[PDB]
Amino acid sequence: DNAAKLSAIKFVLKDPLTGDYLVDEKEIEEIVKKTGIETVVLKEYKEGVVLGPLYEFVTKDGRNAYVLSGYAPGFGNVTVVACFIKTEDGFMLNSVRVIDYSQESIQRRFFPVPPEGLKNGLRVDKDAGLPKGSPEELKKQGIVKVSDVTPRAVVTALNLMYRYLEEVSK
Numbered sequence: 001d002n003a004a005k006l007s008a009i010k011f012v013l014k015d016p017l018t019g020d021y022l023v024d025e026k027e028i029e030e031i032v033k034k035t036g037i038e039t040v041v042l043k044e045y046k047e048g049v050v051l052g053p054l055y056e057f058v059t060k061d062g063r064n065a066y067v068l069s070g071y072a073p074g075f076g077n078v079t080v081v082a083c084f085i086k087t088e089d090g091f092m093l094n095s096v097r098v099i100d101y102s103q104e105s106i107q108r109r110f111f112p113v114p115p116e117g118l119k120n121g122l123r124v125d126k127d128a129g130l131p132k133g134s135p136e137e138l139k140k141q142g143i144v145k146v147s148d149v150t151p152r153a154v155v156t157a158l159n160l161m162y163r164y165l166e167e168v169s170k
Contacts, residue, residue, distance in 0.1 A: 002037050004099050009067050012083035012095040016112045022059040048072035050164040070161045074153030077102030090115040109135050110144050117142030118162050122155045
C-alpha cells in the first residue's frame with residue numbers, strides 16, 4: 001500500500017557516495033512499521049510544513065540518522081523525504097527523494113550537503129548568482145545547481161526539515 005513512502009525512506013538511507021545501505025533494508029522496514037507508517041504534521045511554518053513521524057536510525061558505522069518529510073507551496077500531491085545524519089556541531093544532509101503522488105538524476109543535485117552548507121542555508125544556484133563550480137563544488141556551500149537542467153520548493157522543504165531537527169535536538 002505504502003510502497004512509495006517505504007521505498008523513499010530506504011533510498012535516503014543509502015549512502016550517496018558508495019550506494020550502499022547505511023541501515024539493513026529489513027531493519028529499515030521494521031523501524032518504519034514500529035514507529036508508524038502514517039504521515040502526520042509535526043510542525044507548520046510560514047513557508048511550509050514538516051511531516052512526521054520522525055524516523056530514527058543508527059547507521060552501520062554508528063551515526064544517528066533521521067528521516068523526515070516536508071512540504072512547501074509549489075508542490076500538491078508532492079512530499080519531499082530526506083535523511084539527515086548527526087554530526088559534531090549540526091547535521092549533514094545525506095539524501096533526498098521527492099515523491100510526486102499526482103504523477104531523479106536531477107534530484108542528486110540536492111545531496112549530500114555537509115554541515116557548513118546546511119548552516120549557510122540551502123539555495124538554488126540562481127539565487128546565489130549562477131556561481132561557477134560543478135554541482136559537487138556548489139553543494140559543499142549549500143548551493144543546489146539546477147540552472148543547467150520546482151527546485152526552490154524542494155530547497156524550502158529541506159531547509160524547514162533542518163530547522164525542525166535543530167529545534168528538537170536542543
